[PDB]
């Protein structure tokens, strides 16, 4: 996540020679699609990229404190002095074919933080693990090899599909079926079956 | 024309977590609420002596870096001595569809 409320997960990782590169031979460490921006209206994320690109060039530290007089036009102009396009765009070349991309890429550093939610702590599968004691359904919790929940709403969604057999299998075979005997007169599970 | 006080710095109306957003005055307001809650689950150095504590579940970044774009208030929160991220080089592109 950057510092502006964009979280994300890694989609895929390319190697350095597959990334798009600029003329100076610089490749991104990270690519983030443009469709994140317009509707979050998170302009600070763009200015911070602009500011840090200048800071890194110039070797300063960028003052991003809130209610100052630093403006985009100020940062814009400095960047142009260091010889870059003044709004942070850059010509880049496709990594696969080395051809110039026809659009130019907004491009520069940005503080990203690595959040706590690693995937390996979340992947979870189960076929036939242990069962609770009182109720004898699968236990809960990835840590103890639990089972995922087939909730009430999942039941409804299956009904709307009309899949009556899956709804049954998912509720008896896949959780806790149990054969019991019942008296044909008092329909009570009171039969003492010595089925041996 | 009758001021009886002046604010020390208007940016001091922000708490600790929000004092790390850069240019929070260029953001949509809920976006600042998010980051101010995510940053608490970033991953950095939490104390310089983690090698002698015995906590459950600690996470330490290998190579922290201070942010290139900082905030005056981050000075008092030591955020440049125990920073919690890295200055990735980001491109905003529709590169491969991934």
């Amino acid at each position: 996540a950057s510092r502006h409320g964009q979280k994300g997960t890694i989609g895929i990782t390319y190697r350095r020679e597959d990334m798009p590169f600029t003329a100076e031979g610089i490749v991104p460490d990270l690519i983030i699609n443009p469709h994140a921006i317009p509707s979050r209206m998170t302009v600070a994320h763009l200015i911070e990229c602009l500011l840090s690109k200048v800071a890194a060039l110039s070797g300063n530290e960028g003052d991003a404190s809130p209610f100052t007089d630093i403006t985009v036009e100020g940062i814009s102009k400095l960047l142009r002095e260091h010889g870059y396009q003044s709004r942070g765009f850059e010509v880049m070349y496709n990594g696969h074919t080395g051809k110039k991309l026809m659009a130019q890429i907004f491009f520069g550093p940005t503080y990203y933080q690595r959040l706590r939610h690693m995937v390996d702590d979340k992947i979870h599968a189960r076929a036939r693990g242990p069962m609770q004691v009182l109720t004898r359904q699968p236990v809960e919790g990835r840590s103890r090899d639990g089972g995922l929940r087939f909730g009430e709403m999942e039941r409804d969604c299956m009904i709307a599909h009309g899949a009556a057999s899956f709804l049954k299998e998912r509720l008896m075979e896949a959780s806790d079926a149990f054969r019991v005997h019942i008296c044909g007169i008092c329909g009570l599970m009171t039969v003492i079956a010595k089925l041996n | 024309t009758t001021f009886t006080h002046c604010e020390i710095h208007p940016s001091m109306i922000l708490g600790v977590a929000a004092s790390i957003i850069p240019f929070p005055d260029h953001n949509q307001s809920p976006r600042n609420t998010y980051q101010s809650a995510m940053g608490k689950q970033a991953m950095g150095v939490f104390l310089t002596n983690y090698n002698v504590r015995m906590d459950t579940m600690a996470n330490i970044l290998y190579y922290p870096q201070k942010p290139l774009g900082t905030t005056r208030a981050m000075e008092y929160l030591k955020f440049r001595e125990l920073p919690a991220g890295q200055n990735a080089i980001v491109a905003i592109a529709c590169y491969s569809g991934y």
Partner: peptide, 15 residues
């Protein structure tokens, strides 16, 4: 546009 932490030069070499 930057943060200038070297002001402790002037304030050291003014006083």
């Amino acid at each position: 546009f930057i943060k200038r932490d070297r002001m402790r030069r002037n304030f050291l070499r003014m006083r």
